[PDB]
């Protein structure tokens, strides 16, 4: 059942293999959802606080620990029985990934304890949801949870794509410098609506008696592949004018000189609409609801002018069997002006 219970620099982390194509000894320019370089990453941690965070366009997640506190995640919208939600939980032997109409707890967790104080026999109480009805997807595989664990979560094109990397580091309070690309872990053919997520923690009872979250953005990256096809470096093309130059020249080095790398353009701040100040409506109804229509050989022509034409009244009507527009979109008609209209 349910039980009631800072920022750091992203540096150059959060880069993953954008596709499943082998490349080597080459600089490849790719546009994808990446964690921007030197971005603001939120740092999360007696008290308990494990908040539900927005997913936005995708999430960069990382944690440093030897205690295996982070066990899984919940992804979804309402995170209740009203909608489908994705549950990812890792245990000692397997990872369980399910999509169900879960009724999640406000403070979901796995309660860790030693069975009758046998330290060689650990057990856990699964307290994440109260129900899991109408499951549409289930997947079970090998588990993937000083030790820095990085993940990238994308929800796109019918797939929930997870990338990961596991490396040792010599710091706790922040993310490491240097470059390491995350490799695709699993592509889940789920196809659900995700706007929010939260981390599932393993909590020893004695704890109540850290991880980093960044967001992905549509950015252009220049990725450097070494001879073994490993991504060893990258340039965030929108980070600064130098990175922009590097991407323009398709190189990680720039020679002395002046380069044209982009175009500067002042953007509009307002939309100014100026139409003739008339209120009289165009007499379309008088055409459509005429008692008598002409024969096609002697068709009638009504000239319409100097009026306001609301075409959505006609288009959104259930009474017409045919409504075909040529040279113009039926949904853009109310934004257009004409010199004349013939009916």
């Amino acid at each position: 059942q349910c039980v009631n219970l800072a920022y750091t620099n992203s540096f150059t982390r959060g880069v993953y293999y954008p596709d499943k194509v082998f490349r080597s000894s080459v600089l490849h320019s790719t546009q994808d959802l990446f964690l921007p370089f030197f971005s603001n990453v939120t740092w999360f941690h007696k008290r308990f606080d494990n908040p539900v965070l927005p997913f936005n366009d995708g999430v960069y997640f990382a944690s440093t620990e030897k205690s295996n506190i982070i066990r899984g995640w919940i992804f979804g919208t309402t995170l209740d029985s009203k909608t489908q939600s994705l549950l990812i939980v890792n245990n000692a032997t397997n990872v369980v990934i399910k999509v169900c109409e879960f009724q999640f707890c406000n403070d979901p967790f796995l309660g860790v304890y030693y069975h009758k104080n046998n330290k060689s026999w650990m057990e856990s109480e699964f307290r994440v949801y109260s129900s899991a009805n109408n499951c549409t997807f289930e997947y079970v595989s090998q588990p993937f949870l000083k030790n820095l664990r990085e993940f990238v979560f994308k929800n796109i094109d019918g797939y929930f794509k997870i990338y990961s990397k596991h490396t040792p580091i010599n710091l706790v309070r922040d993310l490491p410098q240097g470059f390491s690309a995350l490799e695709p872990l699993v592509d889940l053919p789920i196809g659900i609506n995700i706007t929010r997520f939260q981390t599932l923690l393993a909590l020893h009872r004695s704890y109540l008696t850290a991880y980093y979250v960044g967001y992905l953005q549509p950015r252009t990256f220049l990725l450097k592949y070494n001879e073994n096809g490993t991504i060893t470096d990258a340039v965030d093309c929108a980070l600064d004018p130098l990175s922009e130059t590097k991407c323009t020249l398709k190189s990680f080095t720039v020679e002395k000189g002046i380069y044209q790398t982009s175009n500067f353009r002042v953007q509009p701040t307002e939309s100014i609409v100026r139409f003739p100040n008339i209120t009289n409506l165009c007499p379309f109804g008088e055409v459509f609801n005429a008692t008598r229509f002409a024969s096609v050989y002697a068709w009638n022509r009504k000239r319409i002018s100097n009026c306001v034409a609301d075409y959505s009244v006609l288009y959104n009507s259930a009474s017409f069997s045919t409504f075909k527009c040529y040279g113009v979109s039926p949904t853009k008609l109310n934004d257009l002006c004409f010199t004349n209209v013939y009916a």
Epitope: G111, Y113, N117, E125, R205
Partner: antibody
Framework: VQLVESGGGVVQPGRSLRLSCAAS????????MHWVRQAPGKGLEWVAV????????FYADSVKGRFTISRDNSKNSLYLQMNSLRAEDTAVYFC?????????????????WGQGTLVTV | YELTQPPSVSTARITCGGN??????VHWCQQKPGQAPALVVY???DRPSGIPERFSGSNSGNTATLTISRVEAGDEADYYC???????????FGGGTKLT
């Protein structure tokens, strides 16, 4: 360590009764508490448990939705509000101090029992 | 979840059955006539201060036992078997076994 129940008595079916228990001899705010009832001629039947901080309240299936367990750490006292009492609820009600159960994450057994107060419906 | 134990026992041994009870911690309390229950054994075989070494127990398979050696007339009480059911967050009591 002592626990004293009060607020018992005789009521008719459909009416409510509030019980209370005064705790002393220990730091009340550091322990969870139980209510247990014993009908005449019967064994012990568990009613409810509340955590030391009052954040978590669990109830027996037979009383869930009718009985409310609460605590007041400032006054070192435990309360049980019993609504819609029925003839089947006749029993001696005990308050007791909880003790951690080694086979569960946050399970409890019972250490110290009060003398109990009789409730007749 | 429920416990099963005999109405009475005449070394006295009080059995407490259940479904793979080995995985659950069994606790025992003693209730004398006209008195409140008191904890005698917890976590299968541990004793609280004040309880004589005569009180021991075990938990294996589908049964748990409270063993009382050198039984005295002062032990004529109702002994209850209880566990915590983590599946429903309830304390489960057995019927209670009377000694004579």
């Amino acid at each position: 360590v002592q626990l004293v129940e009060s607020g018992g008595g005789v009521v008719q079916p459909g009416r409510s009764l509030r019980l209370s228990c005064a705790a002393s001899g220990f730091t009340f705010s550091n322990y969870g508490m139980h209510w247990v009832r014993q009908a005449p001629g019967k064994g012990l039947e568990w009613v409810a448990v509340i955590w030391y901080d009052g954040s978590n309240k669990f109830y027996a299936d037979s009383v869930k939705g009718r009985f409310t367990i609460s605590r007041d750490n400032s006054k070192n006292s435990l309360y049980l509000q019993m609504n819609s009492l029925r003839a089947e609820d006749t029993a001696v009600y005990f308050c007791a101090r909880a003790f951690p159960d080694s086979s569960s994450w946050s399970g409890f057994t019972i250490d110290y029992w009060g003398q109990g107060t009789l409730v007749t419906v | 979840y429920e416990l099963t134990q005999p109405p009475s026992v005449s070394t006295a041994r009080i059995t407490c059955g259940g479904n793979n009870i080995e995985r659950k911690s069994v606790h025992w309390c003693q209730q004398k006539p006209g008195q409140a229950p008191a904890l005698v054994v917890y976590d299968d075989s541990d004793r609280p201060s004040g309880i004589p070494e005569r009180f021991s127990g075990s938990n294996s398979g589908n049964t748990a036992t409270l063993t009382i050696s050198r039984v005295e007339a002062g032990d004529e009480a109702d002994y209850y078997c209880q566990v915590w059911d983590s599946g429903s967050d309830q304390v489960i009591f057995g019927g209670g076994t009377k000694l004579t």
